[PDB]
Amino acid sequence: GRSLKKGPFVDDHLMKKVEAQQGAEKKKVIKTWSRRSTIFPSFVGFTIAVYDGRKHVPVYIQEDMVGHKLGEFAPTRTYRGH
Amino acid sequence: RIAGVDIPRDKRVVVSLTYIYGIGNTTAKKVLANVGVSEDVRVRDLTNEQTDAIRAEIDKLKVEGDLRREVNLNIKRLMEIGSYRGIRHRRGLPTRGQNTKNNARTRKGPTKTV
Amino acid sequence: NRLKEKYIKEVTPSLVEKFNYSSVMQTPKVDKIVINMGVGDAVSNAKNLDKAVEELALITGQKPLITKAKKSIAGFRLREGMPIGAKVTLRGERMYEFLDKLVTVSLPRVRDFHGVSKKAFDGRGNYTLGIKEQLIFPEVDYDLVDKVRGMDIVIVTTANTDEESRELLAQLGMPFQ
Amino acid sequence: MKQDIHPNYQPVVFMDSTTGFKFLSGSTKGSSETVEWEDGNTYPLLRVEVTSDSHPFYTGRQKFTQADGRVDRFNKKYGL
RNA sequence: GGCGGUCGCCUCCUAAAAGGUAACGGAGGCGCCCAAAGGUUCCCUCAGAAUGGUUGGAAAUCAUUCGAAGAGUGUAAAGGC
RNA sequence: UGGGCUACACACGUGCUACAAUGGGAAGUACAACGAGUCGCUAGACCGCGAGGUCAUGCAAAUCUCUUAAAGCUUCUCUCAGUUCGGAUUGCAGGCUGCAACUCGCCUGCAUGAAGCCGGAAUCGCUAGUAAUCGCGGAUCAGCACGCCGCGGUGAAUACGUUC
Ligand SMILES: [K+]
Ligand SMILES: [K+]
Ligand SMILES: [K+]
Ligand SMILES: [K+]
Ligand SMILES: [K+]
Ligand SMILES: [K+]
Ligand SMILES: [K+]
Ligand SMILES: [K+]
Ligand SMILES: [Mg+2]
Ligand SMILES: [Mg+2]
Ligand SMILES: [Mg+2]
Ligand SMILES: [Mg+2]
Ligand SMILES: [Mg+2]
Ligand SMILES: [Mg+2]
Ligand SMILES: [Mg+2]
Ligand SMILES: [Mg+2]
Ligand SMILES: [Mg+2]
């Protein structure tokens, strides 16, 4: 995976939006197109609406999701069976 | 016998240990080198001192039921958080990016020509 | 006799104090233990029951009584009088010896053992324990077994209520959840 | 107790091989090892890997790390 | 009259609280079975339900409690146990 | 900008790897050719189980490097077993390239260890340095092929004949 030296990756525009809200009694949804961004522990408690190609899917970030990309929780293809 | 598994008595120790879930070829060599048991002796020839040394060595590692619960918990987590991988696990499809238009028979099971 | 020794010396004085028993005869005691193996597979092959009975004897040390179907059922392919099921009744010393091994030897060998149920009381102070698989008992030899089978262990006590039976069983040794 | 219908059953001593704990009981099992017991008697000796005095549930003392929280796993891998 | 049905035996209702009592009145059985499903001696008590319990499911075996008969009595019904 | 072209109850084409002992594993030892290279090919040393990393060296090159080729040969081992065969799948941990590898990358370690016991009707290639088998280089290319193009190593069987 991504080299340990490089550290974990998150887009600064997304990281800024979460940082602006950390000290918030009531959080609000963060609309993002950054599927590539890693879920940091600071994301826990937020709902990040992730673009899946056509819409923003609201994903609630539980502490069990840390380390996974935001895109892992916004499937791009719809398949209900043949 | 060693970790609750009757390892093959006729085989050499390096291989007999591999019949333990969580011990592969490389791990078997490591535990024998630590205990000091020659790799070529059939386990039928292992003395109680050698067997107990192996059991002591193996007890350090995570094997058998302990390993199986550990891995199943990992998959359980992927499903619970609703990740893409978890859905792949739950729907019986390849989880590591493999194409499914063809092949994927290991995950899917036998062909349903219908 | 170790568990019986524990019961008469340690358990009895404590239970009298906890429940304020005016006379010692009120103290609940284990009346009997009945191990039952419901073997419906005897229909498909009679020897599965035969091998089941052999293992049941080694676990308890008593030749089991082969129970028979009292009623015919077509769904189970069962005919009245067919020998399906075996049970053993342990009383006195043989009961205490078995209960000791169950508490101290058998239960720890249960795969991923997190204790025995705590709601498994009939409401009258009798506890029944469902053993999922054999090979927890040291007598089974782990290789003779062809089909892994379990058993219903019914501990019958003279306690009038679940609470007293729960306490009695706990102090006698019981890994309740 | 009827004669010649029951399996052979004798007093025996189980040993916890993880700690050497032993107690007196009866069993139908046999072994090639015997030990002396207090009160001046000898009984066959049966080897048990785990007993109630060495099982994690009964003792309560575990031997693993109880897994690693993913938030803790994340912070450890990167020192945050 | 024909067609169909019936033809001997057992149980019930009809049958009017003794018995008997008819109709091409209303319902069912029989032409056996059992070597114990007979005799006797000794012993035993059911069906279901609730609750708990590995495989095990509405329901197969196990335990307790409740349960006067709601079972069973080879074979119809009545009477009986 | 993100997604898709990589979606998967299924059917077919072309491949790759196998189903083992004419083999698998370990150790030791030998022999090519075509090619490519400047911010590229990288010696040597050191660190790491490894993928690789680090300092650093030569070479715009029949001078230096990629590049000590693999089959092979010689010993040891395994002993017919769904196995010490097979390496799919999955868990975990890493390495690289890249602004980024969740959808969609390649590689590494540990663990896991699927089908497969030589394949129905049918069908394909090949007449010798050929088939078979073994590696090696290159184009595209940050990274990424079991494909394609080329290269050498080892190296057979058979053709009576022209009815179909
Ligand atoms: K895919
Ligand atoms: K295909
Ligand atoms: K291919
Ligand atoms: K093919
Ligand atoms: K060899
Ligand atoms: K990718
Ligand atoms: K083939
Ligand atoms: K390339
Ligand atoms: Mg193994
Ligand atoms: Mg792919
Ligand atoms: Mg009258
Ligand atoms: Mg009358
Ligand atoms: Mg009678
Ligand atoms: Mg395409
Ligand atoms: Mg074979
Ligand atoms: Mg030609
Ligand atoms: Mg060639």
Could you tell me how many CB contacts below 8 A there are between chain C and chain D? 66
Contacts of B6 in chain C (CB under 8 A): 142-143
Taking contacts as CB-CB distances below 8 angstroms, the residues of chain A near D78 are: 4, 7-8
Transcribe D29-46 into DSSP letters: ---S-EEEETTTEEEEEE
Subunit contact B65:C143, Cβ cutoff 8 A: no
SS3 call for C118: coil
**From A4, A41, A44, residue closest to D75, measured CB to CB:** A41
Cα B22–Cα B27–Cα B32 angle in degrees, nearest 5: 120
Supply φ then ψ for residue C52, to 5 degrees. Answer: -65, -45
Q: Which nucleotides of strand E lie within 7 A of protein CB?
A: 47-48, 51-65
C and B touch per CB criterion (3+ pairs under 8 A)? yes
Distance B57 CA to F90 C1' (A): 27
Determine the distance separating the centroid of ligand 5 and the alpha carbon of B45, expressed in angstroms. Answer: 25
- The residues near A18 (Cβ < 8 Å, ≥ 6 apart) are A30, A40, A42, A43, A46
Residue nearest to nucleotide F115 (CA to C1'): B106
Residues in chain C: 177
CA torsion angle for B77, B83, B88, B90 (degrees, to 10)? 50
Residue C66 CA neighbour count, 13 Å, CB half: 15
Neighbours of A61 (CB within 10 A): 23
Discontinuities in chain D (C→N > 2.5 Å), after residue: none
Resolution in A: 2.4
Cross-chain Cβ contact D71/A63 below 8 Å:
yes
Q: Would an 8 Å CB–CB cutoff place A9 in contact with chain D?
A: no
Joined tokens for residue A33: 């197109």
Q: For D36, list phi and psi in degrees, rounded to 5.
A: -85, 155
- Closest CA to the C1' of F7: that residue is A77
CB < 8 Å to D26, chain C: 61, 94, 97
b vs e for A8-44, b when ≥16 Cβ sit within 10 Å of the residue's Cβ? bebbeebbebbeeeeeeeeeeebebebbebbbbbbbb
Task: For residue C2, report the phi and psi dihedrals to the nearest 5 degrees.
Answer: -60, -50
In sequence order, what DSSP letters do the residues of C146-171 get, joined into one string? Answer: SS---EEEEEEE--SSHHHHHHHHHH
Ligand 15 center to B18 CA (angstroms)? 21
b/e burial code for range B11-50 (CB count within 10 A of at least 16 → b):
ebbbebbbebebbeeebbeebbeebebeeeeebeebeeeb
Contact D78 A67 (CB under 8 A): no
Scan residues 26-65 of chain B and list those with Cβ within 7 Å of strand F. 26-28, 40
Residues facing C128 on adjacent strands? C154
Secondary structure (3-state) at C29 = coil
Nucleotide nearest to A35 (CA to C1'): F102
- Straight-line distance from CA C71 to C1' E9, in Å? 35
Closest CA to B38 of B26, B28, B24: B28
What are the backbone angles phi and psi of residue B74, rounded to the nearest 5°? -60, -50
Chains B and A touch (3+ CB pairs under 8 A): yes
Closest residue to F112 (CA to C1') is: B22
Partners of B24 in beta bridges: none
Task: Give dist(CA C24, CA C40) in Å, integer.
Answer: 44
Cα distances (angstroms) measured from residue C3 to each of C29, C98, D41:
12, 10, 19
**Closest chain D residue to B1 measured between Cα atoms?**
D49
Distance of alpha carbon B38 from alpha carbon B14, whole angstroms: 9
> Helix (H, G, I), strand (E, B), or coil: what is residue C33?
strand
Tell whether A57 lies on the interface with B, counting CB pairs under 8 A.
no
How many Å lie between the centroid of ligand 7 and the Cα of residue B109? 21
Does D68 lie at the interface with A, CB-CB under 8 angstroms?
A: no
| Distance from residue A5's CA to the centre of ligand 8 (Å) | 25
Tokens of C150: 């379990």
d(CA C173, CA C16): 18
CB-based contact, A72 to chain B, within 8 Å: yes
Give the bridge partners for C34, in sequence order: C89, C154
